[PDB]
Design a protein around this ligand. Structure first.
Ligand SMILES: C[C@H](CNNc1ccc(S(N)(=O)=O)cc1[N+](=O)[O-])c1ccccc1
Lengths: 215, 215
C-alpha cells in the first residue's frame, strides 16, 4: 500500500514547459527501467504517454519526454497546450510482482482563451410529440471557462418549472458543453407563441427562440 | 480499446459481479499475463490481480481472476461500497507489447435502476440557415450514471464530430447527458438517416431521424 511520491499539482501557460517528479526507492523506480507515465482527463480512460522510463508509444508527441536519476523519474511536457491539462500518474514495477503507482500530479494550463458559448435551441421532435412529450433542448457548447447560467422564457415570461441543466463537461476541443432541457406537454408547447433559452457566460447573454413549426 | 471490456456492471451490497476482458490468441489467450486495476475516480489506480489469478498483498479474496481462451474475468463477490470504481484489464502480446481494456464502471446500487429517456432532435431551422446540422440525443432520468453512445450514418458507425457530456446528477437524483453530432448541412441532407444508440445496464435503445422538406 506504498505510493510513489509526486507533487499534487504543477502549472504553466501555453508554450511553457513543466517537469514533474516521481520519487521511489532503490527496489522500484531505482531498481530497473520499468517506469510508466499515464495522462488522464477527469472521467476519461488514462493514456500511456511513457514506458521503460523514456519510450513514447505511437501517437504521443515528442513534446513528452521521460527520464530517471537514481530513485526519481521525471516527465517533461514542453510546449504546453490546452489538451495537456490533466492528471499525470507514474508507476514502477518493484520486486515481488508489485506495481507501485504515484498519487498523481494535476497539471493546470493557466490562461486558456475565454470563449462565448455556441447556443442551439431545438423545438420538440415529431417522435416525442407522437409519444405525448414536448421536451425542448438548449445545447450550449464551445465555452470557457466551464460556468454558465440558463433562464427559459414562455413567450416573454420567465419559466420557473420543468428546467434541468447538466453540469458542464470539458469536451475533445478542450471547451465545455452542457444541455438545458425544458419538459413541456404538447399542450404547453402548442398554447404559447414561442419558448426561449437565455445563456449567461462571463456577464454576456445569448438568447435563442423557437416557435411551434408550420410544417 | 485494444482489449474489449463491458462499459458498465452493477449490483447491490453483498451481491457478486463478473466483468470480462476479451482479446486475441496473441495477447489474452497467448499467456498468463492478465492484470486488473481498480480506480476510484480522480484517485491513483491500484493493481488488484496479476498473472490472471494472483492477488497483491492486502487485496481481499472477494476479488478472483480467471481466464478461458481469449477472455479473462474478474469476479467481485459480496460487493461493498468501496468496490464502486472503474476496473481496467491489461495483457502482454507478442512483441511483449502491453494491451489495455476500455475499463468497466462497476456501481454498487445506491438507489433503484432507471433506464434512460432518449430523445433525438434533428437540425433546427436556425442552425440549418447558419450552415450547421448538429443533431442532439438527450439522455435523462437514468441510474446508474453510466451510459455509452454510438452514432450511425445510415448503418455506418460515425466517430468524427461525436461529443457526449459526462453524466451529471439532476434535481430528481437521476443522471442526464446529451450526445451531439456536429454534421454539415450537406452530410445531413445527403444521407437517408442518422441514429443515436444508447446502451445502459447492458440494454441498447436506438432513435433515428431523417431530413424533411420543412423545418
Ligand atoms: C494502469 C491503468 C492504465 N490503463 N491504461 C489504459 C486504459 C484504457 C485505455 S483505452 N483501451 O484506450 O480505453 C488505454 C490505456 N492505455 O494505457 O493506453 C491506469 C493508469 C492510470 C489511471 C488509471 C488507470
Amino acid at each position: 500500500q506504498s505510493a510513489l511520491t509526486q507533487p499534487p499539482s504543477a502549472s504553466g501557460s501555453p508554450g511553457q514547459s513543466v517537469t514533474i517528479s516521481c520519487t521511489g526507492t532503490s527496489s522500484d523506480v531505482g531498481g530497473s527501467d520499468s517506469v510508466s507515465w499515464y495522462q488522464q482527463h477527469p472521467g476519461k480512460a488514462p493514456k500511456l504517454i511513457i514506458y521503460e522510463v523514456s519510450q513514447r508509444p505511437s501517437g504521443v508527441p515528442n513534446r513528452f519526454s521521460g527520464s530517471k536519476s537514481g530513485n526519481t523519474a521525471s516527465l517533461t511536457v514542453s510546449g504546453l497546450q490546452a489538451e495537456d491539462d490533466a492528471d499525470y500518474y507514474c508507476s514502477s514495477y518493484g520486486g515481488d510482482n508489485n506495481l507501485f503507482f504515484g498519487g498523481g500530479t494535476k497539471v493546470t494550463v493557466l490562461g486558456q482563451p475565454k470563449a462565448a458559448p455556441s447556443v442551439t435551441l431545438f423545438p420538440p421532435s415529431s417522435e416525442e410529440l407522437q409519444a405525448n412529450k414536448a421536451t425542448l433542448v438548449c445545447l450550449i457548447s464551445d465555452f470557457y471557462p466551464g460556468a454558465v447560467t440558463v433562464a427559459w422564457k414562455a413567450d416573454s415570461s420567465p419559466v420557473k418549472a420543468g428546467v434541468e441543466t447538466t453540469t458542464p463537461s470539458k469536451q475533445s476541443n478542450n471547451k465545455y458543453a452542457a444541455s438545458s432541457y425544458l419538459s413541456l406537454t404538447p399542450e404547453q408547447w402548442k398554447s404559447h407563441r414561442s419558448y426561449s433559452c437565455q445563456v449567461t457566460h462571463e456577464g454576456s447573454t445569448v438568447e435563442k427562440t423557437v416557435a411551434p413549426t408550420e410544417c
